[PDB]
């Protein structure tokens, strides 16, 4: 006599500081072509969902 | 969120004089400003935007100037009917927040 | 220069593991019982070798960092791990330095400006305890503040040292060297493979550890598994 | 949006999501990467702040530390065993225990 495992659970630590692409796509202004700006994003958690 | 913080509340002057109007940013609105001229009992009307800029139809006496965080709005040849409340609304930012206001008196 | 014994000193907690009253046995880098260390008191370059035991007993704040690294310059990275007076910061920076580096700003980081990568700050009468290992681009430090009074050499007593932080650096390091601040007395220490069978209490906290190649007594404890013997003869080893 | 890879370890990384905790049911869990089948149950074991989890005298996984909240949790596999049948003898009646 076994019983089985009905559900499956994963744990890992709280999901902090999430990478700020939110200003690249919602800025209110873009620049012109010539002058592409970079923005180095970087030691973030980035979801891309 | 970026606040008005010019720093004359109240200019106090008479026909031919020279009044100069220094508005405060907090973050980078380095072109984009506006200026308005609010008489009591009837709706604002535009005459410098851009921090440098003259409307179609405003005299050729209010001139803007500035760049950057600070910037200021002068006057050469005060008339009586100028008489109001000065405000410096931003552009940069989406959330557009205007100024606090500057009035000028008959003195 | 001069030579001192460490007397059961440089124990810590090779992992994470929670473990009651049980005579745990490890394999790991630890500093051999009752090992001569050598003494400085002033502190030029030293060698990294698969370790490094730091003791200071100094009251002040006048050691304050370290500096790693193994043909140091402007090519390869260094460890700048400088103790300010409210705060550390973890500098790996591809820097090279002139002679005879401290700090009163730094005197190193007069050239030390170039092609940094990585940055980090995390830490903030009594004795100073620290061991250094680089391991599978890893950095490990362990520390442990205990209060020693009126004391000469290294205390007689056992104390566990705790891990601070990793660090992902994954970069060579051969030279070892402290930040003096100049504006004197530590111990140095070196770790080799040995094993060592750790006894920890109800609590979870290592209280006593036995030296398994000290001497024939202390290897029949170790086969044993156990911190005392009974009258008999046992054959431990080949 | 520009990636690139580069020998020095990586600083922008996906997220890992969660699901809620569940206990006193054998569930497979993974905390942190640990892997296993139990049932997880709240534990009074006190932990030092840096271990993560504990083991046994066998070096099997008793108690694990929670990794959003703090706490421990004891691992216990959920029952098996062996059925057996009682009976009197078909001889006399076929009714079994
Ligand atoms: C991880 O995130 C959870 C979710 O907010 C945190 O849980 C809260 O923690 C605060 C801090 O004490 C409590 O006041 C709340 O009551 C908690 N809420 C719940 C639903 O548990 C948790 O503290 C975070 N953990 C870490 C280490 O940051």
Redesign the interface.
């Known amino acids: 006599?076994?019983?089985?495992?009905?559900?499956?659970?994963?744990?890992?630590?709280?999901?902090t500081n999430?990478?700020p692409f939110g200003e690249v796509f919602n800025a209110?202004?873009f620049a012109s072509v010539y002058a592409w700006n970079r923005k180095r994003?970087?030691?973030?958690?980035?979801?891309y969902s | 969120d970026i606040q008005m913080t010019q720093s004359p509340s109240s200019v106090s002057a008479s026909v031919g004089d020279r009044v100069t109007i220094t508005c405060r940013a907090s973050q980078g609105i380095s072109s984009w400003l506006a200026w308005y001229q609010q008489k009591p009992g009837k709706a604002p009307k535009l005459l410098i935007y851009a921090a440098s800029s003259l409307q179609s139809g405003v005299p050729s006496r209010f001139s803007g100037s500035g760049s950057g965080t600070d910037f200021t709005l002068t006057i050469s040849s005060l008339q009586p009917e100028d008489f109001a409340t000065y405000y410096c609304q931003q552009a940069n930012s989406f959330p557009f927040s205007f100024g606090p206001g500057t009035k000028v008196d008959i003195k | 220069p001069a030579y001192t014994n460490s007397f059961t000193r440089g124990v810590y907690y090779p992992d994470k593991v929670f473990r009651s009253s049980v005579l745990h046995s490890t394999q790991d880098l630890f500093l051999p019982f009752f090992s001569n260390v050598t003494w400085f008191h002033a502190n030029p370059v030293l060698p990294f070798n698969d370790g490094v035991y730091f003791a200071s007993t100094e009251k002040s704040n006048i050691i304050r960092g370290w500096i790693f690294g193994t043909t140091l310059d402007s090519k390869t990275q260094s460890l700048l791990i400088v103790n300010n007076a409210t705060n550390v910061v973890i500098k790996v920076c591809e820097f090279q330095f002139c002679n005879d580096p401290f700090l009163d700003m730094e005197s190193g980081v007069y050239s030390s400006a170039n092609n940094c990568t990585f940055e980090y700050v995390s830490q903030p009468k009594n004795l100073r305890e620290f061991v250094f290992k680089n391991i599978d681009g890893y950095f490990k430090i362990y520390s442990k503040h205990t209060p020693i009074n009126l004391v000469r050499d290294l205390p007689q007593g056992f104390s566990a040292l705790e891990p601070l932080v990793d660090l992902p650096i994954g970069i060579n390091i051969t030279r070892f060297q402290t930040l003096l601040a100049l504006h004197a007395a530590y111990y140095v220490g070196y770790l080799q493979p040995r094993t060592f069978l750790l006894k920890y209490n109800e609590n979870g906290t290592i209280t006593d550890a036995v030296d398994c190649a000290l001497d024939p007594l202390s290897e029949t404890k170790c086969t044993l598994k156990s911190f005392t013997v009974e009258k008999g003869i046992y054959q431990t080893s080949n | 949006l520009s990636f690139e890879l580069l020998h020095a370890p990586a600083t922008v990384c996906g997220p890992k999501k969660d699901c809620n905790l569940v206990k006193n049911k054998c569930v497979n869990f993974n905390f942190n990467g640990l892997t296993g089948t139990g049932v997880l149950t709240e534990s009074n074991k006190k932990f030092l702040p840096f271990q993560q989890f504990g083991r046994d005298i066998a070096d099997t996984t008793d108690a694990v530390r929670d990794p959003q909240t703090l706490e421990i949790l004891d691992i216990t596999p959920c029952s098996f065993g062996g059925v057996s049948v009682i009976t009197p003898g078909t001889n006399t009646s076929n009714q079994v225990a």
């Not at chain 1, 006599?1 to 709280?14: A, C, G, H, L, Y």
């Not at chain 1, 994003?41 to 979801?47: L, T």
């Open positions: 006599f076994r019983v089985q495992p009905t559900e499956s659970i994963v744990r890992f630590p709280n999901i999430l990478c209110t202004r994003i970087s030691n973030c958690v980035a979801d």
